[PDB]
């Protein structure tokens, strides 16, 4: 019955992907952003310039107040509100209704985005990082405890129609080839371990611990592929060298300045492919996912005469570890197998195409001492 969930997501990498949900009785419809980087379920419950609609506790007869305040700060953006519970359903998801914790957002700062179309956020990470503390059971945890929905979900994010969030399973019609699994190192963020990095087949030759300093996570709520300072610099130096025959504006490599080319003349060939090797399921075994430039060059509308193809560098620097964002997830079908503490990757049915190259998930590879790649 997963067909009912296929294509249940809308949005793009730049402003996030959202799924339709209902809260309260009678059911109040709201678009909720899918965020594997947090664990709080929260919805705007007060007027805001960027909100076209919001949760009205006053209109719900099943709403219950927890008499507790709460706030959640994010890498970028933050909000505060009042905790409480209510009945939640997912129209284009499993046919069930559960009473889950809900944070009613009363104030926010740089959280809501202009024209994103979503009015709330669905934190799918573990309770360990939920605010105020891990006693506030996350939505997914509530779903699995109150129903027979299997403890796992998968995400097929499609860039530029929309995507799919299969709750409770894996839909084989959404991917090609084999699924490759990497262990979820620890149950807080969806933390993984990168054991090797290559650009155009060239090893970055860095201590693999640098790749996971201070950690590496899979986050649908982040647009870019964010890398620790050391790694980011080496990657840019390598990417620049690969496309040195091209001239780019100032601030382009900072994910700031936009770059354009004549309609259909984007020189993809000058941009290298990036291979991220992830810890595997068996001893001394890893597998790699390959990213095409079509993934790390996020298409953006031309500020003026919208005619040419413009893009923004979708690889940026981080100070809180590696973040495998949407631009990376878009090329694949990602399975968040909570039940077996692992994350699977497979080429997505909606992968972006290239003439002489193709994104891929390949294995097995032998990699010794992978455990030393983890940061402590």
């Amino acid at each position: 019955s997963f067909v009912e969930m296929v294509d249940n997501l809308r949005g793009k990498s730049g402003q996030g992907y959202y799924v339709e949900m209902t809260v309260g009785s009678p059911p109040q419809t709201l678009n909720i952003l899918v965020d594997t980087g947090s664990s709080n379920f929260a919805v705007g419950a007060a007027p805001h310039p960027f909100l076209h609609r919001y949760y009205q506790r006053q209109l719900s007869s099943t709403y219950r107040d927890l008499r507790k305040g709460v706030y959640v700060p994010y890498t970028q953006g933050k909000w505060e509100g009042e905790l409480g519970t209510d009945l939640v359903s997912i129209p284009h998801g499993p046919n069930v209704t559960v009473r889950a914790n809900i944070a009613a957002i009363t104030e926010s700062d740089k959280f809501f985005i202009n024209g994103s179309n979503w009015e709330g956020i669905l934190g799918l990470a573990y309770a360990e990082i939920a605010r105020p503390d891990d006693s506030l059971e996350p939505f997914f945890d509530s779903l699995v405890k109150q129903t027979h929905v299997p403890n796992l979900f998968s995400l097929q994010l499609c860039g530029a129609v929309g995507g799919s969030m299969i709750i409770g399973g894996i839909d084989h019609s959404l991917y090609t080839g084999s699924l490759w699994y990497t262990p979820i190192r620890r149950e807080w963020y969806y933390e993984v371990i990168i054991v090797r990095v290559e650009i155009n087949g060239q090893d970055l030759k860095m201590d693999c611990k640098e790749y996971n300093y201070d950690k590496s996570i899979v986050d649908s709520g982040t647009t870019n592929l964010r890398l620790p300072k050391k790694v980011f610099e080496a990657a840019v130096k390598s990417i620049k060298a690969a496309s040195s025959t091209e001239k780019f504006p100032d601030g382009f490599w900072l994910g700031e300045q936009l770059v354009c080319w004549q309609a259909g003349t984007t020189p993809w060939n000058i941009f290298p492919v990036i291979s991220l090797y992830l810890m595997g399921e068996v001893t001394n075994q890893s597998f790699r996912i390959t990213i095409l430039p079509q993934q790390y060059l996020r298409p953006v509308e031309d500020v003026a005469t919208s005619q040419d193809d413009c893009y923004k560098f979708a690889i940026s620097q981080s100070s809180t570890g590696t973040v495998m964002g949407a631009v990376i997830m878009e090329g694949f079908y990602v399975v968040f197998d909570r039940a077996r503490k692992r994350i699977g990757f497979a080429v997505s049915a909606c992968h972006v195409h290239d003439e002489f190259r193709t994104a891929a998930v390949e294995g097995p590879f032998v990699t010794l001492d992978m455990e030393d790649c983890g940061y402590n």
Partner: peptide
């Protein structure tokens, strides 16, 4: 976007 950069979502805890």
């Amino acid at each position: 976007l950069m979502x805890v």
